[PDB]
Amino acid sequence: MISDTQIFIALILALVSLVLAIRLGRALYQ
Amino acid sequence: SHSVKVYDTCIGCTQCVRACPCDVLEMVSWDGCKAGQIASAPRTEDCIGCKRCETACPTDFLSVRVYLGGETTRSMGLAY
Amino acid sequence: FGGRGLGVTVNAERWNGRHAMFGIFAMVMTSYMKGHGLIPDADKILDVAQWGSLASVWDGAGNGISNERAIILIAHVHVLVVSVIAAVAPFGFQDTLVKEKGYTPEAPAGLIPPFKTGLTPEAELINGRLAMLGIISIVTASVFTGTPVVDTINLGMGKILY
Amino acid sequence: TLNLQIPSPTFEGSTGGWLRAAEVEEKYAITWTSPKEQVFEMPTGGAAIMRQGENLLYLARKEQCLALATQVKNSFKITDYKVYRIFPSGEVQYLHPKDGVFPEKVNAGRVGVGNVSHSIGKNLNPAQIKFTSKSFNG
Amino acid sequence: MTAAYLPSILVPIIGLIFPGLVMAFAFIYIEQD
Amino acid sequence: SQFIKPYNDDPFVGNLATPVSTSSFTKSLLSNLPAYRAGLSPLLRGVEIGLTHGYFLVGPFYKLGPLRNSDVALLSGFFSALGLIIILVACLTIYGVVSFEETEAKDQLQTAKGWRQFTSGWLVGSVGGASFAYILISNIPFLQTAGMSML
Ligand code: CLA
Ligand code: CLA
Ligand code: CLA
Ligand code: CLA
Ligand SMILES: CC1=CCCC(C)(C)[C@H]1/C=C/C(C)=C/C=C/C(C)=C/C=C/C=C(C)/C=C/C=C(C)/C=C/C1=C(C)CCCC1(C)C
Numbered sequence A: 001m002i003s004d005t006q007i008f009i010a011l012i013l014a015l016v017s018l019v020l021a022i023r024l025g026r027a028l029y030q
Numbered sequence B: 001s002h003s004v005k006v007y008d009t010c011i012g013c014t015q016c017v018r019a020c021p022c023d024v025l026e027m028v029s030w031d032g033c034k035a036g037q038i039a040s041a042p043r044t045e046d047c048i049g050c051k052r053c054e055t056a057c058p059t060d061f062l063s064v065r066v067y068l069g070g071e072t073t074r075s076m077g078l079a080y
Numbered sequence C: 001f002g003g004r005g006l007g008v009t010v011n012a013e014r015w016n017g018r019h020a021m022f023g024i025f026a027m028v029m030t031s032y033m034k035g036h037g038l039i040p041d042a043d044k045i046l047d048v049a050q051w052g053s054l055a056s057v058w059d060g061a062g063n064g065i066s067n068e069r070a071i072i073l074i075a076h077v078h079v080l081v082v083s084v085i086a087a088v089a090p091f092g093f094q095d096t097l098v099k100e101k102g103y104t105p106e107a108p109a110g111l112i113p114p115f116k117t118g119l120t121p122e123a124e125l126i127n128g129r130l131a132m133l134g135i136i137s138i139v140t141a142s143v144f145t146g147t148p149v150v151d152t153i154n155l156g157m158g159k160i161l162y
Numbered sequence D: 001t002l003n004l005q006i007p008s009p010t011f012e013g014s015t016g017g018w019l020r021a022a023e024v025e026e027k028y029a030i031t032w033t034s035p036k037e038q039v040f041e042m043p044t045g046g047a048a049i050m051r052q053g054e055n056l057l058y059l060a061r062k063e064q065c066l067a068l069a070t071q072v073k074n075s076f077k078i079t080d081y082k083v084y085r086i087f088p089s090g091e092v093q094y095l096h097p098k099d100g101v102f103p104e105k106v107n108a109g110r111v112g113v114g115n116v117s118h119s120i121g122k123n124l125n126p127a128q129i130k131f132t133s134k135s136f137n138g
Numbered sequence E: 001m002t003a004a005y006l007p008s009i010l011v012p013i014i015g016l017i018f019p020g021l022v023m024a025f026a027f028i029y030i031e032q033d
Numbered sequence F: 001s002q003f004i005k006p007y008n009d010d011p012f013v014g015n016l017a018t019p020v021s022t023s024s025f026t027k028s029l030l031s032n033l034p035a036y037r038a039g040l041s042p043l044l045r046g047v048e049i050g051l052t053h054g055y056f057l058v059g060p061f062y063k064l065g066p067l068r069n070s071d072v073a074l075l076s077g078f079f080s081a082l083g084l085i086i087i088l089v090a091c092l093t094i095y096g097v098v099s100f101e102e103t104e105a106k107d108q109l110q111t112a113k114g115w116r117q118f119t120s121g122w123l124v125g126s127v128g129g130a131s132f133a134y135i136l137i138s139n140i141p142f143l144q145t146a147g148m149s150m151l
């Protein structure tokens, strides 16, 4: 099964995707 | 504010000015029709957009035209 | 946002440093009491029939939050209520969380502020940055080894706590 | 000019009158002269009795004032009415009739605003004026 | 469930704190001049 | 003998002077409420209003909440009332942020500094009143059963 560390890695990748999504939203907003 | 245009098919019957509840239109001198007058819209900041002038116009497809645009306090008919 | 002291400002760095010094203190004192057995009924599973559906965690055995975790959370709830009241109704002398639009930003201290020992803002900022860096280091040492955070603190302090 | 000291028609008051935006954004005034004391319907709901002589009334909207003007024109043969706009700063802007002559009658000096020199079927399609600040009229 | 504390931590946060801050900041943004 | 008159001697404003709206009792009660009473700072208006509303906020949560038949009913009700108080304080904060421009005037409610003082007072009063209600229900068995303890 999945461990705690794997879920934490997925959360870190999702936070990176959040930062990239915020940057794309700021770029689209001019 | 709404935009009101008067096209040169106007026959100067003065019905649109009499139908206006907000005093937006008025009759000015002109040479394009037998009546010698054409409608004009100098006061479109008071235009609510009710299109009573368009209902009043007797020329086949209308000579006076109201284009609804940006809404203001006057154009929204707000007493508040 | 940035005009009120929020974001990357010196005020926000100072506030997070203060909260991080308090976090280092709270983790050390939690480790000390948890090693020494000062939490009453630490393995007691809270029952849904008393505390409602918020006590459900859905683990494999007991299906309830432990009493120790609830005590730690309530201890944090106390200082969160203190936090809310201080954020909305600060003391007249106290440093405020949000600043007025026409405020004067504190100058950035650079690599290191001037070495003013005592109850000076420079020493406060130095230990605040130190505490944030220590929290980062403790988290990384905890997640790269599998050692629990209380146990990681006890190992890094040489088994002084327990 | 608007004489602020003109007496008002006798009204018992109503809930239909002007709101805070009249004293904050803009307010409207209508004056008229009656040959006798007579009962008229308020444009905000209710009956008031206008006095013999001059009458000044305050409204929230221009359309309410012009509705009252049309009512007294077709029911009491009163055509001397004047409608003004009043701001909170106290500047009074005369509105109706703008040049003293009613807008349905031609008066010299009036210039045409918004007149188009072709029929409405000669307006442009949007595809000529997309990505361009040219008007659809030409 | 491995890491069973995470639903009980995140569901109240995502369902009450995230929409409250989003509505507050969006309100501040759309009503400011 | 007419009891209903035009408001403020203006017949064309959108209000009427009625016995319910403009009698001596109504004017005295409104002028003696903390929101209108003269000589009060906005902070003390907030303190009184928050004390009253936060004090009465405890009751429905304690008596009708999902934990009402448990031994921790009062604690849960007070905590729920405190959460509602925090939500309303956030509402006050965003209202004051979006409603007022930053002015020197701070002795009126409808100013930025005055509304911030009013919000601070309302929070402190609400916490104090909720805690007082918690103390009173905790320490008086009459309030715990809402009067069935007499039977
Ligand atoms: C590194 C530790 C440290 C230092 C040097 C300071 C220093 C300062 N803080 Mg501070 N603070 C700290 C930790 C620290 N704080 C922590 C951990 C918290 C969170 C609980 C706070 C929360 C806090 C608030 C909310 C406020 C301050 C404020 C202040 C300033 C005014 C003095 C005051 O009222 O003290 C307040 C001090 C505390 C609340 C706790 C600190 C207690 C220290 C660590 C005791 C150390 C004594 C020790 C024996 C050394 C003695 C040296 C000797 C020469 C006397 C001052 C620059 C105020 C400010 O900036 O106003 C403009 C203010 O409003 N602090
Ligand atoms: C769009 C995809 C999606 C959806 C609908 C859900 C739905 C749910 N997740 Mg989940 N999750 C996702 C992706 C998603 N997940 C991913 C990619 C991860 C890995 C990081 C997780 C990790 C995760 C955990 C660890 C937990 C949940 C939980 C939950 C439940 C409660 C909501 C919550 O707390 O969210 C929390 C979710 C996050 C903090 C991660 C953010 C989700 C992704 C990364 C963002 C997707 C946004 C989308 C593309 C854009 C939307 C725009 C607009 C419509 C708002 C709910 C069933 C909780 C649960 O089990 O409750 C029963 C819980 O504890 N999720
Ligand atoms: C997905 C979002 C979400 C979540 C996580 C919850 C969670 C909960 N709801 Mg619920 N609710 C929701 C959406 C949600 N609701 C919606 C959309 C509605 C409208 C139909 C309701 C209507 C509703 C009612 C009518 C009731 C609940 C109740 C409850 C609680 C269950 C009983 C219990 O044991 O608590 C015991 C209660 C507590 C422990 C009090 C919690 C107080 C919190 C922690 C304070 C936090 C305040 C605030 C979030 C701080 C940040 C402010 C910021 C957002 C601006 C539980 C906390 C019941 C309850 O007990 O509430 C009093 C209840 O009566 N809910
Ligand atoms: C209006 C319809 C209605 C009513 C009366 C109730 C009533 C109740 N619900 Mg329910 N509910 C409803 C609709 C309703 N529900 C809907 C539509 C949903 C979503 C589908 C829910 C979902 C829901 C959940 C999930 C839960 C409840 C719960 C509750 C109980 C406690 C709620 C609570 O804490 O209130 C708090 C109330 C207040 C803080 C204030 C009440 C209003 C005051 C009394 C008004 C006073 C006005 C006053 C006279 C003015 C005087 C001014 C001046 C003259 C002095 C209670 C029996 C909880 C429970 O235990 O279930 C039984 C629970 O967990 N409800
Ligand atoms: C819709 C539209 C809006 C505008 C933009 C747009 C692009 C045009 C589009 C948005 C779109 C889509 C793309 C938006 C979807 C977006 C993203 C993916 C949302 C993900 C959020 C993840 C949460 C915050 C974090 C978990 C990490 C936490 C902080 C970690 C803890 C960590 C773990 C425990 C391990 C230890 C270390 C620490 C660090 C402690």
Ligand SMILES: CC1=CCCC(C)(C)[C@H]1/C=C/C(C)=C/C=C/C(C)=C/C=C/C=C(C)/C=C/C=C(C)/C=C/C1=C(C)CCCC1(C)C
Binding pocket: C020, C021, C022, C024, C025, C127, C128, C130, C131, C133, C134, C135, C137
């Ligand atoms: C609030 C509370 C109320 C009353 C009681 C009280 C005690 C007065 C108070 C508590 C208060 C506060 C004051 C207590 C909080 C206190 C202090 C600030 C604790 C600081 C800890 C920092 C340590 C863990 C780390 C250093 C990081 C190491 C790993 C590494 C650095 C290295 C690594 C490899 C990474 C690269 C950098 C280099 C340098 C090369």
Ligand SMILES: CC1=CCCC(C)(C)[C@H]1/C=C/C(C)=C/C=C/C(C)=C/C=C/C=C(C)/C=C/C=C(C)/C=C/C1=C(C)CCCC1(C)C
Binding pocket: F051, F052, F053, F055, F056, F127, F128, F129, F131, F132, F135
């Ligand atoms: C009944 C009557 C019949 C029918 C008609 C009617 C008129 C509608 C009706 C009237 C009805 C309604 C309107 C009744 C009116 C009701 C309101 C709800 C009464 C509120 C009282 C609050 C008092 C007890 C407390 C203050 C808290 C004390 C000072 C604090 C101690 C705290 C302070 C901060 C200091 C620290 C310690 C702590 C404990 C934290």
Ligand code: SF4
Binding pocket: B004, B019, B020, B021, B022, B023, B024, B025, B046, B047, B048, B049, B050, B051, B052, B053, B054, B066
């Ligand atoms: S739409 Fe109404 S207000 Fe506007 S000009 Fe036509 S009749 Fe007058």
Ligand code: SF4
Binding pocket: B006, B009, B010, B011, B012, B013, B014, B015, B016, B017, B038, B039, B053, B056, B057, B058, B059, B063, B064
């Ligand atoms: S109603 Fe039509 S035809 Fe008559 S004057 Fe007005 S625009 Fe011309």
